[PDB]
Write a structure and sequence with these properties.
- The structure is a homodimer.
- By secondary structure, chain A is an alpha/beta fold.
- Chain A folds into three domains: 1-70, Helix Hairpins, CATH 1.10.287.1250; 71-203, ATPase, nucleotide binding domain (Nucleotidyltransferase, domain 5, 2-Layer Sandwich), CATH 3.30.420.40; 204-479, Hexokinase, domain 1, CATH 3.40.367.
- The first copy, chain A, contains 14 helices and 13 strands.
- In chain A, the strands form three sheets. Chain A has a six-stranded mixed sheet with strand order 1-11-10-9-12-13. In chain A, strands 4-3-2-5-8 form a five-stranded mixed sheet, sandwiched between helices. A two-stranded antiparallel ribbon of chain A has the order 6-7.
- In chain A, helix 3 packs across helix 4.
- Chain A is globular, with a radius of gyration of 24 Å.
- Chain A starts with 14 loop residues before the first helix and ends in a 9-residue tail after the last helix.
- The interface between A and B is medium-sized, with 26 and 28 residues.
- Bound molecules: beta-D-glucopyranose (BGC) (2 copies).
- One beta-D-glucopyranose binds at residues 150, 202-204, 223, 225-229, 261, 263, 410 of chain B.
- Chain A: Residues 145-171 are annotated as: Glucose-binding.
- Chain A: Monomer and homodimer. The monomeric form is active, the homodimeric form inactive.
- Chain A: GO terms for molecular function: ATP binding; D-glucose binding; fructokinase activity; glucokinase activity; mannokinase activity.
- Chain A: Residues 203-451 are annotated as: Hexokinase large subdomain.
- Chain A: Belongs to the hexokinase family.
Amino acid sequence: KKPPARKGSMADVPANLMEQIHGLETLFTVSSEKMRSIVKHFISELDKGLSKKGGNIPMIPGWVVEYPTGKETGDFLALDLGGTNLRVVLVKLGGNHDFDTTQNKYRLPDHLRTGTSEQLWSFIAKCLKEFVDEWYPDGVSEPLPLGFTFSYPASQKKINSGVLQRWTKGFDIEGVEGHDVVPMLQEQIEKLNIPINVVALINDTTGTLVASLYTDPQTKMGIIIGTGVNGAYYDVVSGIEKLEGLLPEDIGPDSPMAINCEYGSFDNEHLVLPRTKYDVIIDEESPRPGQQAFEKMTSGYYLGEIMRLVLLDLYDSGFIFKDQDISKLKEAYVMDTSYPSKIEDDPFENLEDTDDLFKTNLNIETTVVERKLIRKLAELVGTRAARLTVCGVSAICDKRGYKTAHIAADGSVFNRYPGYKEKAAQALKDIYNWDVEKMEDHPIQLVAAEDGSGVGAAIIACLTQKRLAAGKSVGIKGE
Amino acid sequence: KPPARKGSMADVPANLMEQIHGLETLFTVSSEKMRSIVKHFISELDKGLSKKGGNIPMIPGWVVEYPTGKETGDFLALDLGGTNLRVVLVKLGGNHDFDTTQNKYRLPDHLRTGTSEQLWSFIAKCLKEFVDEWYPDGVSEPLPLGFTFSYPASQKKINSGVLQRWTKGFDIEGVEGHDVVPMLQEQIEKLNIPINVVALINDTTGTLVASLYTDPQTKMGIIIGTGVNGAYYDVVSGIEKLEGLLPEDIGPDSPMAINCEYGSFDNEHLVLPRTKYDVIIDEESPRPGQQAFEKMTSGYYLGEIMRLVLLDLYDSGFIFKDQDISKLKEAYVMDTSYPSKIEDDPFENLEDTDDLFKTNLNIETTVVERKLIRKLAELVGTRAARLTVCGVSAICDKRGYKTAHIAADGSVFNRYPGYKEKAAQALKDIYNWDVEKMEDHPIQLVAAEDGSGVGAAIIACLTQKRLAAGKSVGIKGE
Ligand SMILES: OC[C@H]1O[C@@H](O)[C@H](O)[C@@H](O)[C@@H]1O
Ligand SMILES: OC[C@H]1O[C@@H](O)[C@H](O)[C@@H](O)[C@@H]1O
């Protein structure tokens, strides 16, 4: 039994502060009408991204050109390469929308993030060899098809290729950007005579879509709502004008095509996104000003920072923390996502969880009325983030004409942000005006995803291998 | 959650396998042993209710009725902890349902070593400032309050509590030996607050009552955490230590909530399947020879058992050869999160376990070592679960409950990995049921309601009713 929401009476809050809360409410509220307008623009930009001219939204073809039917069977590998860890996963598809996993994880030695190309790929291969040797001590009938989640910006002219465009997350390995990483990993596999074929390179959201669709046939989208944000869905080849002239005959106009949207870049021009002066500051102070605008409005990573800047603004205008030492509130990113999470979770009318948090982490003694403001603020910023995120869901559903859908979701915000599911479901209900009483009955609803970067990569490897074995294309002509 | 790892032992050398099988032998509790334990446990529960008494206190809770779920009204709960107090307003909606409004206050740090008036006046102040908020122009009835005061305390009636001894490092002059209820009540009065303290309870009693109010199948309340306790309803005719002391309106057939305090079961060290490691734990504890059942079922000791086994295996040449095991020598360095993280590890190479040992204990392990350590964490969590359900079985069997919800709370039941599955399989091994889904077990643990808040408030509701009516809530004369 988790506690009921606190009542959260505002009766005792001073007028001077109540006016400021009201100011922040008006500022952070996203109306049904504003959401539906954002969605309209979002749809144009999803289409723009697929067009020969392209757009701000990458809309990257994932080269998965069929839906998993759930009937697939067999043993497939996945490799998930993170910044600190890699996971090797063996997936046996049971052919009734079911699967079994056997998996290892290996911590990436600090060295590798800045070492040589051969060192990165030999370490990966050595992990693969240790894994395969244990699970297949007799060796193997046919090699194992492997799907490789390489979640770094890469371009693909076909699924079994991935040309690194730019390392992220502290990786500084020379000689890899501009090159196809698939042969790099494959030749280290070969050097160790490990029976594996690397057949697919994917982004993890694409894996999220496909794995969840294999187990849940109502899945129409995979979404990540966490430190970064992304969505993936199936479009149709006839709707991807930028592939016109590039496709072999066996990838026809009505072929499905999984798209990795990379929609974190939606509305960098801020035509529709409701930027406050706080989002302005967060943007101008970020590594990349003017970029990742939709990411900056929906990601878990900025939610405490938004609160921080708001609280500082109220301190400077003389509203709160009067005669407190707030020199810790001045540090950028000192309030991470656990701040509005802990604040929203507070079950006490006197908000004692919040009291402790602000006293112990930030050395600020709050009055009860200041806490009621902090909590109101936490709610508004959690709530707006969820409301903006479902604008992406709604754009993809509307573009494709999905009147019902399971949206398979993952990431730290969906999984752990307090009341996030309730917020998202209410936002969808507001957009569509459904006459439905309970969230479990929403025509469009977010559900917990399957493991995109392990299970999804292995199912993609299954789908891919079947095409490669038949000589069906998984990329543009000639590649 | 990911599925359970496969857990192959195929690569573990013979010398290590032999030791793993040795740990298995040591830490496995068979059905039959659980049964021998359940027979002696019942004997000790009957014993604690006798005139002579026994190692198990079996304290009458002076709740002499079941909640029907039909109760309605506004009630307060006060839950005094060592660091914090909680004040809860509970509105009962009369269909097994309730609503709460609650505040939590830090005790100023001087209260531990302050005066009697200091403690009660601060509590009353928290109450006043709570009631002033949620009731702008008072109310007609004073609010009945249930007080969870979880310090050793004797009661001849529910609306009394004589402090036996302070625990949790409290040190207040003038309280040990006196009824704390009038003490709190006169500070409430001295602040003119509309509150009537009608009940003083232990939290397990509240866990029982609150859960029975919401769930009619509740037959026991159990805490499995840092400490362990259980509470259930016996029958007044089964409480011989009460004969001659009771008024006629608490007759032979009357229900009586019992706070078992059964942590002290088997302090003689006669029946619980201790190992040499448990012996060390007991001998090195603050209270050697005390709380034997608690030492065998609390989550507090699960990592310590593991530390001692691993040390014994190091000393004996089997593991961590040429590792720096200094950190492993600190008693209680492995808290409950060790066996917990280890059991939760989803990887065949047990990487969660690897990272835990390297980062926290500076011990680098081999995969096969980690496989041992994983099997050990399992054995140890599994034994603690099976011993816990002996106490559940003992109570159920004593009362002829063939079917029961066991309303459970505490850090082990709530967070220890696969604890529910382990308890459910234990229960299934004892009774030999022919079932295949835990949701269909005749006897089963379910998540409890809030005992120390909601439960204290429901107990106030039931007590205020008897008081309003003139019905006894304690021994004759009291
Ligand atoms: O939080 C990270 C998420 O956001 C995006 O920036 C990445 O491309 C996703 O595929 C990823 O799962
Ligand atoms: O975790 C502490 C628990 O263990 C026992 O020793 C106490 O008497 C219970 O009432 C309590 O909730």
